[PDB]
RNA sequence: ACCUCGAUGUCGGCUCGUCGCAUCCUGGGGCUGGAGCAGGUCCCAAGGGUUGGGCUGUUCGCCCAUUAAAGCGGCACGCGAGCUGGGUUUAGAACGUCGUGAGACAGUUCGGUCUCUAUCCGCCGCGCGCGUCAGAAGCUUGAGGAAACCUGUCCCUAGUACGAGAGGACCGGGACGGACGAACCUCUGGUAUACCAGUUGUCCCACCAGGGGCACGGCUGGAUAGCCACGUUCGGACAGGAUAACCGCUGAAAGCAUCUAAGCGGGAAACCUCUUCCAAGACCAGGCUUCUCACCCUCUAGGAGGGAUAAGGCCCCCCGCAGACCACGGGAUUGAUAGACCAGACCUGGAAGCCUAGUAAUAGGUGCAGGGAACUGGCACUAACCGGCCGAAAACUUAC
RNA sequence: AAUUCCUUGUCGGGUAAGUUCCGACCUGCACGAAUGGCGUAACGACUUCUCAACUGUCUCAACCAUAGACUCGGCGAAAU
RNA sequence: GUCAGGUAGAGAAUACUAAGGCGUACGAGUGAACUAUGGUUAAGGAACUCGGCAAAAUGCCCCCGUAACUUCGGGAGAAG
């Protein structure tokens, strides 16, 4: 099975735009006096030191 | 008509008949309901009865769910759902507020159990619609379980809807008919089936009268 | 057989067959 | 506890049931371990049946913790220090907290630590 | 659950020892046979001084399977071999004596001969 | 303890002996043939128990002329009236499938002294 | 000899279908050299059904058991980017015949690589986006579709109708089945890679005792939940509308007759409703009803753009018998959603230590003991968090 | 018959049923004596048929674990 | 081409292991179908198929006992 045809211009684009990412979503965490933003995941880690905010 | 309940689906047990026979009974707990609403003709353009079922804590509502049991006077409950009736010489005798019970029914009368069946997940054709494999054997080449051949050859030149193959199978809405009800369990509310009904224990039953034999 | 009637053979003896069913049923007129 | 439900971790069986027991046998030793997140799930209920068997210290239960284990330093801290700080708590002696993933593979990581409140 | 090509050890006296299930009657395409089920069957063993010979097509009833049968009461009988009763065209045995503990089963389905000639019906 | 429970407790049948795997037993079924009705005596040894309170059941292994029957019952079953435990088995196993490939003398079980 | 030789893979079998009717069974009839039972021939009818084996590569055919019946055909003599490779149709070798010979066969015999990661249409499933004249939510109507439609034996009727015997019914009731399908796991069975016990070889925990690693889970005997079938329960009904072949009533053209030209009726598994399921992307995008029903800024105010909100939703978190991911469902401290802990059910079957009897292998007591996952009920001990992102109204015409 | 077209020749044995198989007939299309004829104990990953044991080859499939498949992070082709 | 530990064993086969050497270069997850490689299976046991292809079975040591046929060696580890 090969493709029996070159793909038109507009077809590739269209597929191709399904190919992203996503932005993960951040929320403010005071540690050592400086506002951070952290994922809301590592909300509990962040305070008890666990991660390190390069 | 038809009388119906909204119940949930407790398990299965064996119970003894009375020529000490067994008879393999699934327990339904067909829990007090109330009405809380009712489809006339005039405004609907059908006739129904609407139920309410199962505890919520008001706390959990919606706002616009919250005040459709407002303007019937009725505390929230989970599940609402609604019996087709059939012409007003029926709904005449349901009203808004009233409760209905498990003592509805009688021992021995035909019921139809309505519910979700259990969910077997993206299943093969051999497992959902019932094929054959190829040998397992005999030189077969990597095809003990594909479905073979699709159709024609350059005339059909294409696949006919409806064929069948792999997918997604279960979990849909079935109905078995004509159950015998064992017996009616009033003190604790609850339905002895004869047979085995649709979903999985937990799930949400309407017990109805048998539209052939009832 | 490159010429290939070895496909007629069967082709013929169907014929035989056929002949036969026609004969059994003229045998169920006048038996009737 | 109830068995993984779907593949094992360590690539089969055998490799899992020891790799499960390399895990408790160093988080009974230092108190604190990082590791991968579905890894520090399945040792959780795993270790926190074997702090049972230390809270009921019998002869029966040292002998129930060692075939696990097989360590004997970390069995003797065990049944000398964990079983009875955790005397009077019951259930639950271990948390989970959820940190960065990795680099190399971007592998969901968590720590899993020895509760110490009370 | 006797099937075609099943061989079944034959508890009557008429001579045969062993035979090989040809068919099982009761409908189309009808693939088990359990207690008191007629089958059709060849006799693949026979004693030499025998009223009946090897290689002859007959008629015969099981009337002991390996395999759990149900019963309305909700017990179940299973005995440790498959045996069958070499009968005529009139639901009646060939033989004179039969051997071993039958199923009860042969009672509701009108082997009344069969019933009563069994030392013990189970 | 279950969900349903209310339902098999009136179903539950008391004064069943307290019997084992092991054990002689003769249980006194009862048969219906011609409108008529009697009890049949099954006597043999209890080769198996499958727990379920109501759904309970128990199998007894007979040897009789030369072929060895099964029966399965269940243990709060109507059709029974009397269970009457004779010996005490001393066994080791809790299902005795291996007492269905041996004949004659292998196949006594010891007697629980 | 018109398409294809800068390739349209050739016979059988398997898997999977779909259509025609010139109908094998079941359904309705006309005629009969049709007494009955059973037939013969023709007409109407495609809803469902149409078995397993012996011989041959075989299609075909013959045969053995049955059955209500074991239909005929089309779709590249359907179906090899779905499978086989027995045959035909390469290279080896031999037999018969032909040839002086290399070799050949219109004959036979033993053996002989079956390649490909699906781009497009097509089909089975599942999502994201926008639309349905504000933003949400609960419950639903059905245009239009999909699925299912099979049938036997016995007992009354009745040894009655018919017949002179032998034989033996129509119609109408009742019971029990075969095959197929759907749901379920109480029962019977099957499986069990974190359950329990026995045990062989070896290495280790200093040694005894007690255990562990490896050898297909080392091998054996059992095995709750889940998934299943060999298991359990249920289904293909009753009624109606319009009709086919056929049967007719009233009736002329044609003083009679005629089922026909005016009218009126009977009539089958075929058709439409009846049963189960999907379904408002049904662009005429539906209906009943309930919530929010509200603020600011800028271009030059015509409209637009931007910001912030409510009802509600999403993401993060604890999970599910929901699941490829997504989706669906439940829970989130005002908390029983998962784990842990306590107890129960069930599975295994009598733990370790000690005491006793034996020279010893080993046995008995402490003891329905010990160990244990899925099922049930309790208990906030552990984790569901001192949280982010979306998300609401130009009006006008006419009747009233 | 490794040779026989007509052919599934005819009779016998085996099987419930045997175009294959074993024994025999002779009407040898188109066997035949070192291109050897007819047999033969032992031997054959040769070809043909029958039987006991055994089994998922099948009636009729079901369940478990691993390597892919599927999801995520990195590198990143091909025929056409 | 040369060395050849221990315990089972006839063995340099096979299982575990000492000295010694490695964990060898994409990973993390997740019970989809399907494919591949292992495992188990009720009742029946070749009914599958071109054909018992593939699986299953038999499997060691010591005793007892072993047919037709024969070139007198065999058949023979016959069978049981």
Same mark, same amino acid.
């Given at each position: 099975?090969?493709?029996?045809?070159?793909?038109?211009?507009?077809?590739?684009?269209?597929?191709?735009?399904?190919?992203?990412?996503?932005?993960?979503?951040?929320?403010?965490?005071?540690?050592?006096?400086?506002?951070?933003?952290?994922?809301?995941?590592?909300?509990?880690?962040?305070?008890?030191?666990?991660?390190?905010?390069? | 008509?038809?009388?119906?309940?909204?119940?949930?689906?407790?398990?299965?047990?064996?119970?003894?008949?009375?020529?000490?026979?067994?008879?393999?009974?699934?327990?339904?707990?067909?829990?007090?309901?109330?009405?809380?609403?009712?489809?006339?003709?005039?405004?609907?353009?059908?006739?129904?009865?609407?139920?309410?079922?199962?505890?919520?804590?008001?706390?959990?509502?919606?706002?616009?769910?919250?005040?459709?049991?407002?303007?019937?006077?009725?505390?929230?409950?989970?599940?609402?759902?609604?019996?087709?009736?059939?012409?007003?010489?029926?709904?005449?005798?349901?009203?808004?507020?009233?409760?209905?019970?498990?003592?509805?029914?009688?021992?021995?009368?035909?019921?139809?159990?309505?519910?979700?069946?259990?969910?077997?997940?993206?299943?093969?054709?051999?497992?959902?619609?019932?094929?054959?494999?190829?040998?397992?054997?005999?030189?077969?080449?990597?095809?003990?379980?594909?479905?073979?051949?699709?159709?024609?050859?350059?005339?059909?030149?294409?696949?006919?809807?409806?064929?069948?193959?792999?997918?997604?199978?279960?979990?849909?809405?079935?109905?078995?008919?004509?159950?015998?009800?064992?017996?009616?369990?009033?003190?604790?509310?609850?339905?002895?089936?004869?047979?085995?009904?649709?979903?999985?224990?937990?799930?949400?039953?309407?017990?109805?009268?048998?539209?052939?034999?009832? | 057989?490159?010429?290939?009637?070895?496909?007629?053979?069967?082709?013929?003896?169907?014929?035989?067959?056929?002949?036969?069913?026609?004969?059994?049923?003229?045998?169920?007129?006048?038996?009737? | 506890?109830?068995?993984?439900?779907?593949?094992?971790?360590?690539?089969?069986?055998?490799?899992?049931?020891?790799?499960?027991?390399?895990?408790?046998?160093?988080?009974?030793?230092?108190?604190?371990?990082?590791?991968?997140?579905?890894?520090?799930?399945?040792?959780?209920?795993?270790?926190?049946?074997?702090?049972?068997?230390?809270?009921?210290?019998?002869?029966?239960?040292?002998?129930?913790?060692?075939?696990?284990?097989?360590?004997?330093?970390?069995?003797?801290?065990?049944?000398?220090?964990?079983?009875?700080?955790?005397?009077?708590?019951?259930?639950?002696?271990?948390?989970?907290?959820?940190?960065?993933?990795?680099?190399?593979?971007?592998?969901?990581?968590?720590?899993?630590?020895?509760?110490?409140?009370? | 659950?006797?099937?075609?090509?099943?061989?079944?050890?034959?508890?009557?006296?008429?001579?045969?020892?062993?035979?090989?299930?040809?068919?099982?009657? $009761? #409908?189309?395409?009808? &693939?088990?046979?359990?207690?008191?089920? +007629?089958? =059709?069957? /060849? @006799? %693949?063993?026979?004693?030499? $001084? #025998?009223?009946?010979? &090897?290689?002859?097509?007959?008629?015969? +009833?099981? =009337?002991? /399977? @390996? %395999?759990?049968?149900?019963?309305?009461?909700?017990?179940?009988?299973?005995?440790?071999?498959?045996?069958?009763?070499?009968?005529?065209?009139?639901?009646?045995?060939?033989?004179?004596?039969?051997?071993?503990?039958?199923?009860?089963?042969?009672?509701?389905?009108?082997?009344?001969?069969?019933?009563?000639?069994?030392?013990?019906?189970? | 303890?279950?969900?349903?429970?209310?339902?098999?407790?009136?179903?539950?049948?008391?004064?069943?002996?307290?019997?084992?795997?092991?054990?002689?037993?003769?249980?006194?079924?009862?048969?219906?043939?011609?409108?008529?009705?009697?009890?049949?005596?099954?006597?043999?040894?209890?080769?198996?128990?499958?727990?379920?309170?109501?759904?309970?059941?128990?199998?007894?292994?007979?040897?009789?002329?030369?072929?060895?029957?099964?029966?399965?019952?269940?243990?709060?079953?109507?059709?029974?009236?009397?269970?009457?435990?004779?010996?005490?088995?001393?066994?080791?196993?809790?299902?005795?499938?291996?007492?269905?490939?041996?004949?004659?003398?292998?196949?006594?079980?010891?007697?629980?002294?």
């Amino acid at each position: 099975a090969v493709p029996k045809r070159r793909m038109s211009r507009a077809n590739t684009r269209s597929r191709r735009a399904q190919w992203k990412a996503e932005a993960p979503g951040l929320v403010t965490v005071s540690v050592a006096g400086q506002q951070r933003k952290v994922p809301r995941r590592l909300l509990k880690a962040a305070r008890l030191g666990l991660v390190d905010l390069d | 008509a038809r009388k119906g309940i909204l119940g949930t689906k407790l398990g299965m047990t064996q119970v003894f008949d009375e020529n000490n026979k067994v008879v393999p009974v699934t327990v339904v707990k067909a829990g007090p309901n109330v009405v809380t609403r009712i489809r006339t003709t005039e405004r609907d353009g059908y006739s129904a009865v609407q139920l309410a079922y199962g505890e919520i804590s008001p706390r959990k509502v919606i706002k616009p769910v919250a005040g459709q049991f407002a303007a019937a006077g009725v505390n929230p409950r989970r599940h609402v759902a609604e019996l087709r009736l059939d012409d007003e010489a029926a709904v005449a005798e349901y009203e808004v507020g009233q409760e209905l019970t498990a003592e509805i029914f009688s021992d021995g009368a035909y019921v139809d159990v309505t519910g979700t069946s259990k969910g077997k997940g993206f299943a093969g054709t051999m497992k959902r619609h019932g094929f054959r494999g190829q040998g397992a054997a005999h030189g077969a080449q990597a095809v003990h379980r594909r479905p073979g051949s699709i159709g024609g050859c350059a005339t059909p030149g294409r696949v006919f809807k409806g064929t069948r193959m792999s997918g997604r199978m279960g979990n849909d809405r079935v109905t078995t008919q004509n159950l015998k009800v064992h017996k009616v369990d009033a003190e604790n509310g609850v339905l002895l089936i004869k047979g085995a009904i649709p979903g999985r224990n937990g799930g949400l039953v309407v017990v109805r009268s048998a539209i052939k034999r009832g | 057989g490159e010429t290939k009637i070895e496909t007629d053979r069967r082709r013929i003896r169907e014929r035989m067959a056929k002949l036969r069913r026609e004969i059994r049923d003229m045998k169920k007129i006048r038996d009737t | 506890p109830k068995p993984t439900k779907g593949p094992r971790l360590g690539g089969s069986s055998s490799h899992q049931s020891a790799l499960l027991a390399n895990l408790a046998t160093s988080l009974f030793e230092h108190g604190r371990i990082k590791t991968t997140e579905p890894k520090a799930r399945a040792l959780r209920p795993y270790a926190e049946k074997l702090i049972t068997h230390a809270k009921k210290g019998a002869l029966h239960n040292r002998r129930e913790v060692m075939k696990k284990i097989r360590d004997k330093d970390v069995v003797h801290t065990l049944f000398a220090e964990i079983g009875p700080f955790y005397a009077d708590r019951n259930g639950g002696y271990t948390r989970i907290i959820k940190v960065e993933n990795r680099k190399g593979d971007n592998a969901p990581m968590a720590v899993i630590e020895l509760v110490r409140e009370k | 659950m006797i099937q075609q090509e099943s061989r079944l050890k034959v508890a009557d006296n008429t001579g045969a020892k062993e035979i090989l299930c040809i068919r099982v009657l $009761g #409908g189309s395409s009808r &693939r088990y046979a359990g207690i008191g089920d +007629v089958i =059709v069957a /060849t @006799v %693949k063993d026979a004693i030499p $001084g #025998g009223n009946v010979k &090897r290689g002859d097509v007959v008629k015969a +009833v099981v =009337v002991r /399977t @390996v %395999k759990e049968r149900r019963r309305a009461d909700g017990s179940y009988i299973k005995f440790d071999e498959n045996a069958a009763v070499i009968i005529k065209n009139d639901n009646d045995p060939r033989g004179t004596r039969i051997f071993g503990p039958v199923g009860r089963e042969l009672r509701e389905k009108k082997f009344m001969k069969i019933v009563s000639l069994a030392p013990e019906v189970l | 303890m279950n969900t349903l429970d209310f339902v098999d407790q009136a179903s539950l049948r008391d004064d069943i002996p307290t019997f084992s795997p092991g054990d002689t037993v003769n249980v006194h079924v009862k048969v219906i043939e011609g409108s008529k009705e009697r009890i049949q005596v099954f006597k043999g040894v209890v080769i198996r128990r499958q727990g379920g309170g109501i759904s309970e059941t128990f199998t007894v292994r007979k040897e009789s002329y030369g072929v060895g029957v099964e029966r399965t019952f269940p243990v709060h079953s109507p059709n029974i009236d009397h269970i009457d435990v004779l010996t005490r088995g001393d066994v080791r196993r809790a299902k005795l499938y291996y007492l269905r490939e041996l004949r004659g003398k292998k196949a006594k079980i010891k007697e629980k002294r």
